[PDB]
A paper describes a structure:
To investigate the conformational states that FluPolC can assume, we collected a cryo-EM dataset of vRNA promoter-bound FluPolC, which resulted in a 9.8-Å reconstruction. We attempted fitting both the transcription pre-initiation conformation of FluPolB and the transcriptionally inactive apo form of FluPolC into the cryo-EM density map. Overall, the transcription pre-initiation conformation of FluPolB produced a significantly better fit, with clear density for the PA endonuclease domain. In agreement with previous observations that the PB2 C-terminal domains are extremely flexible (Hengrung et al., 2015, Reich et al., 2014, Thierry et al., 2016), the corresponding regions of PB2 in our reconstruction were not resolved, presumably due to dynamic motion. This suggests that, when bound to the vRNA promoter, the polymerase exists as a heterogeneous mixture of conformations, with PB2 undergoing large shifts, which is consistent with what has been observed for vRNA promoter-bound FluPolB, where large regions of PB2 electron density are missing in the crystal structure (Reich et al., 2014). Part of the PA C-terminal domain also fits outside the density, but this region correlates with an area of poor resolution, likely due to particles acquiring some preferential orientations in vitreous ice. Our cryo-EM data support a model where vRNA promoter-bound FluPolC is dynamic in solution. Thus, whereas FluPolC can indeed acquire a transcription pre-initiation conformation, this is likely only transient. Next, we modeled FluPolC in a transcription pre-initiation conformation, based on the domain arrangement observed in the cryo-EM structure above and the available FluPolA and FluPolB structures (Pflug et al., 2014, Reich et al., 2014). This revealed that, in the transcription pre-initiation conformation, the PB2 627 and NLS domains would lie close to CTD-binding site 1 and could potentially directly interact with the CTD peptide, hence contributing to CTD binding.
Influenza virus RNA polymerase (FluPol), a heterotrimer composed of PB1, PB2, and PA subunits (P3 in influenza C), performs both transcription and replication of the viral RNA genome. For transcription, FluPol interacts with the C-terminal domain (CTD) of RNA polymerase II (Pol II), which enables FluPol to snatch capped RNA primers from nascent host RNAs. Recently obtained high-resolution structures of FluPol reveal that it consists of a central polymerase core domain made up of PB1, the PA C-terminal (PA C-ter) domain and the N-terminal third of PB2 (PB2 N-ter), and several flexible peripheral appendages, including the N-terminal PA endonuclease and the C-terminal two-thirds of PB2 that encompass the cap-binding domain (CBD), mid-link, 627 and nuclear localization signal (NLS) domains (Hengrung et al., 2015, Pflug et al., 2014, Reich et al., 2014). The structure of FluPol has been observed in two major distinct conformations.
Residue numbers in the entry:
A (entry chain B): 1 to 636, 653 to 749
B (entry chain A): 97 to 145
C (entry chain A): 582 to 722
D (entry chain A): 194 to 533
E (entry chain C): 1 to 485, 496 to 740
Amino acid sequence: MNINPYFLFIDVPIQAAISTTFPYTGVPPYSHGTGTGYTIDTVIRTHEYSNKGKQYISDVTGCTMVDPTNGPLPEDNEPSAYAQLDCVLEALDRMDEEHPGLFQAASQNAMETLMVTTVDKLTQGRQTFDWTVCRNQPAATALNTTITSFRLNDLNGADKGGLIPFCQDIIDSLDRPEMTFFSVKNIKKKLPAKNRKGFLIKRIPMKVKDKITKVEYIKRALSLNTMTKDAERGKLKRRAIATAGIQIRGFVLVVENLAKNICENLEQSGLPVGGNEKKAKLSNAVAKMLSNCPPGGISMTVTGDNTKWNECLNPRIFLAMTERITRDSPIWFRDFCSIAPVLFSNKIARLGKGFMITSKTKRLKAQIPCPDLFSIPLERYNEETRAKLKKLKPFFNEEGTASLSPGMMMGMFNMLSTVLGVAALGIKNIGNKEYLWDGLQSSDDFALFVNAKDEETCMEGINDFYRTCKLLGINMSKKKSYCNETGMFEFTSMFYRDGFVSNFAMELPSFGVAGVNESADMAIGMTIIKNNMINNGMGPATAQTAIQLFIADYRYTYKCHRGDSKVEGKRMKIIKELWENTKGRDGLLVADGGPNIYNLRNLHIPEIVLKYNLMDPEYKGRLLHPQNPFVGHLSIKMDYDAVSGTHSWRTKRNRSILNTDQRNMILEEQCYAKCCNLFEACFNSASYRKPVGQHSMLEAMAHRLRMDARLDYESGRMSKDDFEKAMAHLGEI
Amino acid sequence: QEHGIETPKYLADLFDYKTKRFIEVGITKGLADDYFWKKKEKLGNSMEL
Amino acid sequence: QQMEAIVEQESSIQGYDMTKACFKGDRVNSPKTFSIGTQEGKLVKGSFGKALRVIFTKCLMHYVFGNAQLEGFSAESRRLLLLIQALKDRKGPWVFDLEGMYSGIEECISNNPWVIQSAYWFNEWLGFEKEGSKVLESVDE
Amino acid sequence: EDVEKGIDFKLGQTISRLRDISVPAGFSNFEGMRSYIDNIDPKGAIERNLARMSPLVSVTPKKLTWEDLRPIGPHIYNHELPEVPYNAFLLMSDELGLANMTEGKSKKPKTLAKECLEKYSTLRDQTDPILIMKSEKANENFLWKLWRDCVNTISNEEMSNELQKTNYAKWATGDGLTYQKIMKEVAIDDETMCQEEPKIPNKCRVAAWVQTEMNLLSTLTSKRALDLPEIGPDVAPVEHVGSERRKYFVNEINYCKASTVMMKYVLFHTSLLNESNASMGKYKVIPITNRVVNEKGESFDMLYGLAVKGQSHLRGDTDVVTVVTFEFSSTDPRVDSGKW
Amino acid sequence: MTLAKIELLKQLLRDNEAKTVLKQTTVDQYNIIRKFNTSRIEKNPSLRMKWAMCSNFPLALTKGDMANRIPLEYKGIQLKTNAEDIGTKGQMCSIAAVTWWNTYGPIGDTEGFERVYESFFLRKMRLDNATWGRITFGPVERVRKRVLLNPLTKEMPPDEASNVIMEILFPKEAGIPRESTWIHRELIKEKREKLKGTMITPIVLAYMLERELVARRRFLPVAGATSAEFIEMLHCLQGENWRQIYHPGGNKLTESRSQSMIVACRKIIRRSIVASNPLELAVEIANKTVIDTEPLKSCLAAIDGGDVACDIIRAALGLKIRQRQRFGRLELKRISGRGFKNDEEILIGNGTIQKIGIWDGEEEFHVRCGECRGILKKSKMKLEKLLINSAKKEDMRDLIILCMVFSQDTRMFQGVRGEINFLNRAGQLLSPMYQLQRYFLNRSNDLFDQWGYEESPKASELHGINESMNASDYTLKGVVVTRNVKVSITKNLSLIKRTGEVIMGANDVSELESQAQLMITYDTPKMWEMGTTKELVQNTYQWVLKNLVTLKAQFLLGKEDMFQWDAFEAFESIIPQKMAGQYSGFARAVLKQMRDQEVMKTDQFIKLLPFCFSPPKLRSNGEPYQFLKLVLKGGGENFIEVRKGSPLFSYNPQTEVLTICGRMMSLKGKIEDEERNRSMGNAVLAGFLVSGKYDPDLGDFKTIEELEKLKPGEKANILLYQGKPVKVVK
RNA sequence: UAUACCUCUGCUUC
RNA sequence: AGUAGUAACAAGAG
């Protein structure tokens, strides 16, 4: 008797048992080595979709530019990037006509937001391309380097605090003939020592001023870094993703804020709608389309998906979109909003590491940097790369980068593109034919409803929608998209079948131990179960099972099995002692080899708070010692409820930096850290609330400490000695 | 807060340590009496005018 | 979870805990039976527990043979699954480039045992469904 | 003396010049596009375009019928291809666990495997290799030497589970097999060096061992393998319903085969990861352990085989550690050679 | 401590780097240089942790004495190492070091801990003190709504909350005084007193404060209970297919009762309306309804709120009826006069037409807003008199404005400028009057200017006031500030007074069916009856299937005996009363077709049998109303198709599987032999039979308007479901 | 050339 | 060898 797990689908329908078609217990595919091939693929294809447009050499950068917009319409189903401005403007006019006031209101909100937005805002951009060192760095560091660099070119917009002067300095820095910036280099110095030879050589780092010419700077300012996307689910082959510089961030923020402020008020945009609310939108949007045409009215649903979404959409359109949307706004704001598209219209793409060539005979390998990419016979590359490199040539730059005028990068203008999709959804009809379409949009993923009298019309409506989208540079995936009679459909891995079904598989990877620490991961671990019980349809048995499995994973990962158990380990050896010593054993946390007291009803309660009354005074005292060394200097995506105890620790820093030339940044860091740690002692609220001021960081501390001294004296805390000493010290400062 | 009194709602100019009183300085052109009672409307009697 | 969903859905229908009923049967109801697999070219009815264990096993095999081929195959085949459901429900489904779907799926079938077996199972099932369709095709008409 | 406070933000020559060349075709400069957008009314453009666009651009829709659904993967039935071979990390259905009754509490793995092999000495003492089947590019001598080194190393009286870095171990682990990195300047001059053509997965056909694996792994046993920890006491009815449900749901899986296989994988990987980081440069022997409880309620420790950990200086997450598996079985590979 | 800070400052300033950093860096830029580090973002912490935990010394300590109290090793075990951490510049250590510290470390001060983390403990007491109820299996309609996740101390906007936190924790650094301080001075005082002696770091106190001040509102699938102290237990309260009665401990709000009470009463009424002798049901149910813990009696008795339904029930059990209304912030009680709403179109001041319900008839209310009280006398679009008391200016103002708007005066309607069709922050369109309220509450100058003034009252006790809420000789037209501060119920739930007049209309309650706040329980058999559309639908069809054995048999014996059955009363309470009869008359006929003639369809019988309860309504001709789909109350989804399947009801004849609201049922072993090639046309229209198949010469598929107008014995084409043409005759 | 059967590193990007 | 799969590891660095 041959078992067939598919045969379940004879009994239970596919949506009802959709969880079993997701292999999320398995491993997701990671990348290996270089992504240059994947980047080059994108560069070639992006131009492949627009090569019948207008080619021209940029007199600024000296790069090869291609312009599809207002180009010849396609005569085939190959991904077209040839959008038509007029049609976009009409699609916009329709949206404005049906949503009047939104266009200017959103702009005013975004403007009034911008005006308040400070520079520090840029620090929360995660990985950012640092143009000074030409590497992906933390946003804060990439920003700091850019500010310190700007300071050398007499650009102190940052000192004012606001974003506007900084952005001004950014667009101004383009005019600079030679951009100067710091670069660190080492120096030997004989420090005194008790070392036979009475001295020691420590390489003290020192900063050096380095110059870049206007063009070479502009090229970096316009550059985008690239890397293969790891762990991307539900796909065979890998692909590339990009990272932006510090310059464009401020200009994108505003545009996305605007597009957000717009999208929020649209009813056919699924962004920034929470996954839970997306159903509230979708099911209703369906309910509307259902009861609209009773008499033989065939309501069809189309499970949409777009191809080459990023590689077809052109900045030149987004510029027009900003220009239209900002109609009523003043000029400076239009000029402000217009910049990011202008940059993306003239952007440059970096090609990652390169390609590794080898000899099996000699067992040798070597990476060929993108500059040296062509310093070799093309026959020595493999068959595909040989084809790619030939096609890359016309868009290739001397310094080893690829010019890329058309197309967008993976995840840049999500909002503003979603708007362009909704704009397609806004037409609803063409030529007064007997049908009406509506739908929901989300970047490259869309769901299209079509109501009409007979399906022959519906299909022509869908065809009209397709042919329409072509004019916006939006390309529907004939291969991945499919249509059916309304009642069931799929949208961003959410499955509707006369009501959205659960897809428990999707969230299953989150059940594991998160990797923050012992304290947090518990809270997270229970909270995930608690939430998945509510939203994703997990019964009490399965939930209670997950409660067990998580503790199982938790105790192995953090090596903290039951104190009564006999599992051996360095920690366990002490845990057992703690078990023997402690009286209120049920008061012990699992991290301390305590018993799991959680169940369905108290998932939402922190373990410490649960067990507090069961703890011994010394154990809770030690566990919650106010000045314990394990918890660091805290400072106020999902958040959790947890208590700050000894299990709330932080791990060691990655030490690989120690034996590289970036050692400096440790001293550069700690140099700040000292000043900030002190400034926090002077101003305790600094940790909570962002301090404000364009004045000197020292001045504040001086004044504050002076007042502290004076008041501590006159109140009767400090003695005349301490006051005179304090004032004597401060006097010098 | 240290002296233990109410915080002025506006930003004063000086503070007298012996009197424990905030002081608001005004530089008028014409008459002083005109500039005085106008301040009295805002500051009431929080600061010494 | 996938089965407790069925236990809950059933318990909804009869207003009490239908677990024992689904597993073993009871005073009122018979035990739950699923189409579990084939035997000399004909269906076979397996119990709830077997249907559970089959899914557990499948989920294990998802890990034990988990890779890009499985991801691509599952993801791309899920569509064809959904279409087959649309056909089963008679919701008149339309396609735009089926060769694209197929070409998308079949490139993921190379040297992954679970993929290569799942394809076979999929074809067997797809086979057995077409015999079922013959019941609906001539209803009313 | 009063003045209006406007926002100061104006564009320079460079960024302006950039903007000027960031326009659609048919525009002399940006101001043109700005005025154009601000002024002209494009109503009718969409339809007027759709009118002139080629008919070839379409969606080419077709209503789906069952006969259009041709069987996927036509090549998997072709016998001209090689049937897909077993490629998992450990054995699943074919596993054979040496059982050792214990108190039912944790002991040291070496001691466990030692006592297990002590119980089943007849196999442990076998130094005479009877080779049945041989992987194409394997080395019988090295492998058997490695097996004996494992058995003896574990069976000995000392604490360490470290293996001597012998030649057979260095082969089985793959010592020094990494290529040497060199300067681009050299590689560019070296004309013999080339980009390697990538290895693409082979096109296998269907194999019945999968089907059987499915048939067997889903079957019941009298042996429970799961290590499910305790939870809080029940209070709310929901918790009692859940707890009562678990008795039906959990045990139905726990008693089945796949559960033990899974627990084996889990518990193995758990230790393998620990050794991989704790003892990077040391070749170490790790037992394939799994505790099991029978229907009577007696804790049998199961030893399915022994594994050799390679050199694990793992930097990148994807970096590989080579692990050599020696696993007991009752399956005669000659029966289904295509599997092995 | 100051001396130490200054000394450290001087020691730091020696370092030229630190000096230049302190001199060059700005107070703004502090926010940047703080986040400067060599650290990188962990993209796979789940893995990196599992890896790191297998290392020797993964953790980093803080440099200090408490670190030095930890020994290097302990009984062979290496606790920590000499090597410093790059980030902390303190020693590194193994996780064991934690387990040591917890076992043999220094015992620290934990006084205040409970008060600091009070917010969390309140959950623990809200669970520990709670009491659980019954668990019930059966369908549950979950509505996805934004809700408050946790109960707060006092809800504020983030900006307002942060300032309070700042006032509590860092009073010297609060900066510019806000009004908030004066509003929450008692809260500040309290938290200041509660959090004084503790040793815990302020940054934690601010976090816990912000947790219990700032609100966490999120979209969730909810059913019944929506109060925070219910939401926090939501995972246990319900599923899709089960319900759990839960009674949380601690005190509960009054408004939370007032919220649910109304829904409960409305829901009782909506059910009891359809059944004859409504009062009987209403009383039967209301007697045994429960709001969390309080009975509806106790609630209606104790609370002085209600609206319409509440009074009707109040008069059904026997107690006073507070005819009170709420216009946003304005609270009204009825003194005399019963007005009637009439939908008209008004051209409002700014120059736009608006469909508004104008209230005809004279009315007199006892009025209160915040602290300001008064008496209101109004007529159709006119403020006749407004006799208020003196109070705070904003209350007097808002009272007068809310009265001006509530009165629907033309002087108000013709006082609009700009636009008044703004949505709320979520993006929802407010109602015509509430928009005018939200508008004129802000921009009142137009109203006050457009209103008009007149002579003040010269009676000693009376006074008049002006636009700025100050005494004046010229008062606002119709405004005065004075110094001085049985019933029975019908069978059909209308309240009558001794003089015969009716004051409450059974058809005067809101049809709007909102989610309650607390646990709405019905301590009676058949709870479902007071349920949602789909719940009732499902339970009904289930009850049909459960008794199909007898129901299908009696249909060949008892003529109209089945059509009326206890269970169907509920179902009918779903159906629009304007269609119930038309549906019943059709269903009964289509069924009678399958009875009297030899063409049965069990799947259809089951589908239609519930619709036949309500007394039928045929056309003038005697023929019933033909239908494509039978619509139900609420949600465009909720309808039963006649020819095709539907979101609520569908049938799969391949497996003989009936789908009800998603749930699966098996009809196998309960179907006749000849239902194989039995077309559906013989049970789609009443008095119609299939002759042949689609004959092109007959033309197109004829719609209901045509089919009803076709003469008897006349062929026509009909489309069952998509791709199934049929040739039918009357 | 050497120190170097030494030293540092396991997400730290060139 | 092997892991693995459109490119890598099978240690790297001073």
